């Protein structure tokens, strides 16, 4: 204080909704519903949302609004022994920027690709095609669809790479798209939230315009009801299995943003007596509701593919990049006015990703802006240096073998790491700092204590929720592979480095902080577990 504040509350809400709603709302939630008993999946999903996701989501938002600092300073002021959590969270967000932007660039690349009266990925008689190409998805690996070969052999040129050891030529048309993304991010974030919170009005709202248009074209298609059937038809037999609850737990956790320091930074610009609890609920709800909607958008079209284009539903119903960059564009191309559906689809994909990259970077800038007045004074300079380091290292993912690089980070950069970070975040808040202090902090802000429900969830449910995900994510571990390629053991260990490079800050910094403090070790856990709020009276 003085600390800059949101130019208006809608800016905050859209920044948060924009961060939380991204591509996985489209390319994973509907797939999980289809795979796990249809609308029955909503039960495990809703329970995980209620006892795990939203409480963690609420917590970080309240915590950021109360302590009014970014992730490093905040965790340091709250429990100095764990200042490292702020460092861990910061460079997890740092790694994620190295690859996640590439998805946006692919979106722009397909967008620039659809300025035409006849979409390229339609047919199997192009220079990049293979003797084995089919018009649509099949179930035999050696025979790709026309859209799959376009993505793979034309956009990516992934066929020309023999692995992560063979990144090949830089692909400048991609680097151009990667640069445009970073320019859009720079001129969105250099001036701070005064413009960043205005930009999100587009990037957070645009997808809903397109979701509506596609939802109508989708549901008017022949076979669209058949798709909705595959999407939502209940089968509670799935609920019996542990793997389904783990799928719900993990989806809930990664879909909401909790513990990345992003919600922390955004809430840190809230007015102190803002009703952060009302904001956390409205915001959670919109995230999940968007996934629900998008599922109709996807499977109406997926149903139209099965009914009309003559393809097994199981072959087109898929997750991840393949759904949005291959299967959906395939369906679009068969439709009248296809060029229009393609241009707004790929635009939606990019705006879906942009709000999210915004939040990741802001978690970083705000964290560093608060630790270091040097960079806070020079924001417009600092981000330019940061996005420059992004663009340069990111050129690796614009190479012909670039997917192999993307896929490596996508697995190791944030996955296992953030779960342990958030696990200590929960443990720090509820048990070191105390739910008592926290509840009291929340009342001083919003006028009432959190219910015993939110308290039980933070203290008990949350940590074993995160524990539940982390353990099944270990027991299910296998060495990294993509399609027929298997990554070399050194590549595997290198990702373990990226994974532990951040997690290690937690015990590292705890060890280093102990060795600058005067007293005996009973005396020293106390000096490092006493909150900054209390030392200053």
């Amino acid at each position, epitope marked *: 204080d003085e600390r800059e504040t949101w130019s208006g509350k809608v800016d905050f809400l859209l920044s948060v909704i924009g961060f939380a709603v991204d591509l996985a709302n489209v390319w994973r939630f509907p797939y999980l519903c289809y795979k796990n008993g249809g609308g029955a999946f909503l039960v495990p999903y809703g329970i995980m949302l209620a006892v795990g996701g939203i409480p963690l989501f609420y917590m970080e938002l309240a915590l950021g609004q109360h302590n009014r600092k970014g992730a490093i300073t905040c965790w340091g002021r709250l429990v100095p022994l764990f200042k490292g959590i702020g460092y861990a969270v910061v460079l997890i967000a740092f790694y994620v920027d190295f690859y996640y932007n590439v998805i946006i660039a692919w979106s722009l690349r397909f967008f620039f690709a659809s300025f035409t009266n006849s979409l390229p990925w339609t047919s199997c008689n192009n220079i990049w095609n293979t003797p084995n190409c089919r018009p649509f998805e099949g179930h035999v690996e050696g025979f790709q669809s026309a859209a799959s070969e376009y993505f793979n052999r034309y956009i990516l040129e992934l066929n020309r790479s023999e692995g992560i050891h063979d990144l090949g030529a830089i692909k400048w048309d991609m680097a151009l798209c990667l640069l445009i993304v970073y320019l859009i991010c720079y001129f969105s974030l250099w001036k701070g939230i005064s413009t960043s919170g205005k930009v999100v009005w587009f990037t957070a709202l645009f997808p809903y315009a397109v979701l509506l248009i596609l939802l109508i074209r989708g549901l008017t298609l022949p076979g669209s009801f058949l798709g909705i059937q595959y999407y939502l038809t209940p089968n509670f037999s799935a609920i019996y299995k542990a793997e389904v609850w783990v799928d719900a737990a993990t989806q809930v956790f990664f879909s909401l943003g909790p513990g990345f320091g992003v919600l922390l930074a955004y809430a840190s610009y809230n007015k102190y007596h803002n009703n952060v609890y009302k904001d956390a609920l409205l915001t959670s709800f919109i995230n999940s509701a968007t996934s629900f909607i998008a599922g109709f958008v996807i499977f109406s079209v997926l149903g139209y593919m099965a009914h009309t284009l003559g393809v097994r539903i199981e072959d087109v119903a898929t997750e991840g990049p393949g759904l949005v960059f291959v299967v959906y564009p395939a369906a679009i191309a068969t439709m009248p006015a296809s060029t229009f559906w393609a241009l707004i689809f790929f635009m939606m994909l990019a705006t879906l990703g942009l709000d999210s990259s915004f939040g990741g970077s802001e978690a970083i800038i705000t964290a560093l802006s608060d630790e270091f007045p040097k960079i806070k004074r020079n924001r417009e300079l600092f981000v330019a240096g940061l996005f420059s380091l992004y663009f340069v290292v990111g050129l690796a993912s614009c190479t012909q073998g670039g997917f192999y690089f993307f896929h490596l980070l996508d697995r190791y950069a944030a996955g296992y790491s953030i779960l342990v970070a958030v696990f200590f975040e929960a443990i720090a808040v509820s048990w070191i700092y105390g739910t008592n202090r926290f509840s*009291e902090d929340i*009342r*001083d802000m919003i006028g*009432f204590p959190p219910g015993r429900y939110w308290q039980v969830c933070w203290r008990f449910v949350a940590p074993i929720f995160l524990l539940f995900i982390t353990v099944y994510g270990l027991i299910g571990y296998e060495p990294l592979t993509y399609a027929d390629y298997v990554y070399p053991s050194w590549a595997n260990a290198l990702g373990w480095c990226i994974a532990g490079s951040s997690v290690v800050m937690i015990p590292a910094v705890a060890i280093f902080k102990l060795l600058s403090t005067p007293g005996s070790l009973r005396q020293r856990f106390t000096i490092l577990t006493t909150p900054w709020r209390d030392q200053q009276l």
Partner: antibody
Amino acid sequence: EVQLVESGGGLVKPGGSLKLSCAASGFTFSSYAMSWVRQSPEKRLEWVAEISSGGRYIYYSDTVTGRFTISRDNARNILHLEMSSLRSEDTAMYYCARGEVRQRGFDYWGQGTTLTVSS
Amino acid sequence: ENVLTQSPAIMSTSPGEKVTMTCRASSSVGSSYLHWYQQKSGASPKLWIYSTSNLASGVPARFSGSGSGTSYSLTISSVEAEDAATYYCQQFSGYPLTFGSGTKLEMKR
């Protein structure tokens, strides 16, 4: 059930000082913020100070700030108002009042204890 | 400091009659932050209506409360002699917390 009992009031010369106390019982005293509210002989109600459930957030009316000090003993369940350089304007019945939720008000009150400041 | 002025100051009413009394703040008060207390002669105040409309525990249905912004009111639909007391309104929308100036309710006979 819930019961609050103020004590310690009495005659005091101006500039003098005195310590009121409120004995909470019948509920979990640690969980609730507490306030002192006074009522002058002219029957006006005037809020004095509020202390957090954990005692970490303290607010004072401008009338008593820098003279009064609100305190909290969560182990023994006793609220405290420590007065000093008292003046005749401080003459009132002092109430101790539960008030953890702002949206819900002061849900329970003591019977009050009377301060009289005179020469 | 958000002054709350109440009128009337004193009020006489026959049992069975409707009674209304008003609270005017010098600044806007969120309706979830406006409350009323009744204080019978010689006794401590009791919480009575909280956040504008909500009857407190044990408060008979005769009572009701309404308002927003800078204007609020207590209404007793059919007065009873046990209802004679002084009513105080209050805000928590901001520190310093402030109480209304009182409406003393009295029995006509």
